Structure formats: structure tokens, C-alpha cells
Design a binder for this molecule. Sequence first.
Ligand code: HEM
Ligand SMILES: OCc1cnc2cc[nH]c2c1
Length: 289
Amino acid sequence: LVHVASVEKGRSYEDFQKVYNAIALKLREDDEYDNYIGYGPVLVRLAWHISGTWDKHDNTGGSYGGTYRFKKEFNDPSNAGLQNGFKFLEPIHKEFPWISSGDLFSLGGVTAVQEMQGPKIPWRCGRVDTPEDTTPDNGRLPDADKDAGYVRTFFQRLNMNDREVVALMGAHALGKTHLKNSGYEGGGANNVFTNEFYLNLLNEDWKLEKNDANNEQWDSKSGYMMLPTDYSLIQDPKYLSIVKEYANDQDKFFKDFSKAFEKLLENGITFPKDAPSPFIFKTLEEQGL
Ligand code: HEM
Ligand SMILES: OCc1cnc2cc[nH]c2c1
């Protein structure tokens, strides 16, 4: 399976910056969502989940085809809650109907990260919608109740190494878990992209408790939580070193996250040698908007 990026006809940087701006303006407008967290975190999760179906072995899944729009993937139990992100993007797609679904979902994640004061994430266009029969089966996204070995093995399927995994997981600084979505509850309400996930792991007093869904999670006195898979990053000595690294260097985390997140969003895509360079979008703040 080869998926070749094909630029939406006649479109260039300015077109996608307009889409970015529309997403960013709506992020600012619809600020009440999820107890005033806003839609930032769920858009980041959406971009990750539409990418995280990828399988390096046969190039099935991945962001390219925009298959989350199809019921099988939309209704994946692993994707519970992401419907809110999709609904958010509906008026954006209506205003810019020329953008492909994969481009829109991935761009949503990039926009959210940047607007939440995270690192720049270079982004490339050219994902092309593929038919309903290309939708990957449910079950390719990760379980949260497992250990470091599970996480390591899981991410090998996405061609991610230890540093890439630990960097990507830093997105768990954002938003929260919702009992009705995933069987986990809590996490606060952060919508600013920082390295705080690593600081929280290292600095908080964690207790292994059971939540109201009878699942174990790690809770701190201060009211934070970590999934078992989050906490596994300080149980494994190789992950732990990297956690400490990012806890002590905000810039290094930003740079590594940016690389890993772009890679995640681009897995499975062949870019022609003469494709445009990756775009780096200006934030609303940078534009004075
Ligand atoms: C082992 C890997 C991972 C596991 C098991 C996992 C699991 C989860 C679970 C269970 C939730 C709560 C969903 C809910 O109840 O609403 C969540 C939330 C979230 N995840 Fe992950 N995740 C993983 C990796 C990632 C990665 C790689 C990213 C992005 C780079 C990411 C981004 C997010 C974000 C932003 C939220 C908050 C969503 C919201 O506030 O609505 N996660 N994750
Ligand atoms: O409490 C911190 C926190 C916030 N959000 C998430 C998402 C997964 N694990 C998390 C942990």
C-alpha cells in the first residue's frame, strides 16, 4: 500500500493558514467546552487517534485516508469522546470543503497544540480521502491499563522509539480523562501545552486507587491522576531517564514533541520529491488576530 500525498488543487500556504485561523478562532470562541478546558485537548487527541491506527507492516490505517469519518472508526470504543472534536470541525470543513478529511483532522491537532502555547509543529498537506472499505478495524489504539513493556511494544507498530514515546505522552499534560469515555476519571483541566506531565509524574505523591468504574489509576493528593500507562514511564528505567530529561528542559521537550508529533501525523504517507516543504503556521497571537 502506497499513499502518495496530493496537494489539494491549486492550494498553498495561505489557504491552509486560513483553515488554521478558522480552527484557532473557534477554539477561542467555544471556550466553555468540558468545564472551560475548551476543545484544544480533544482536537490533539483526535489527530493522534486518526494517526495511531497506522501499521508499519502493511501501511494500513494512518491519517492519510481520513477514515475516521466512517462509522466503523467513528464508533471505535477507543475513540469515545472524539465525536466532540469532529463536531467542532464540522463548521470548519463546511467553510473549507476543499480540504481532505485527513488534512483537516491532523491540522486540527497542530492548530490546537500551537494555540495552547505549545511548540510549532511543521505540517504537510496532501492526505487524500480513501473509501469506506479502507477503514481500519477497531482495536489498533492502545489500552491504558498495561505496563511499560506493553507501551514499548505497542509503539513499535507505529515505528516510535523510547524517546518518541515519552515525548508523545507529554501531551497528557492536556485535558483529562472522562469516566464515561474510557473508564478513567480526572486529571484537572489544563489547556496550556507545557512539560508539566513529566514534572507531575516526578513530583507528585501518587497512590494506586480504584475509580468508580473499578479500574486502577494513580491519584495524587493535589488532585491529579495518571493512567497506569502514564505511570509506567517512571517504572521503567529507560523511560524514567527520558521523563527526567523533559522535566528539566522545556525546550528539549518542545523540540522532541514537535518532531515526534509531525512524524506520527505523517506515518504512511509518501511525499513526492517536489512536494511543498512543510508549512509552519503563525498563531493568532503572532498575526495580531
Ligand atoms: C499508551 C498510549 C496512550 C494511552 C493508553 C492513552 C490513553 C488515554 C485515555 C484513556 C484518555 C482519556 C480519554 C477520555 O476519557 O476522554 C486520554 C486522553 C488524552 N490523550 Fe491519550 N493515550 C495515549 C497516548 C497519547 C498520545 C500519544 C497523545 C498525543 C500526542 C495523547 C493525547 C491525549 C490527549 C490530549 C487527551 C485529553 C483528551 C481530553 O481532554 O478530552 N494520548 N488518553
Ligand atoms: O492529571 C494529569 C493528566 C492529564 N491528562 C491526562 C490524559 C491522560 N493522562 C493524563 C494525566
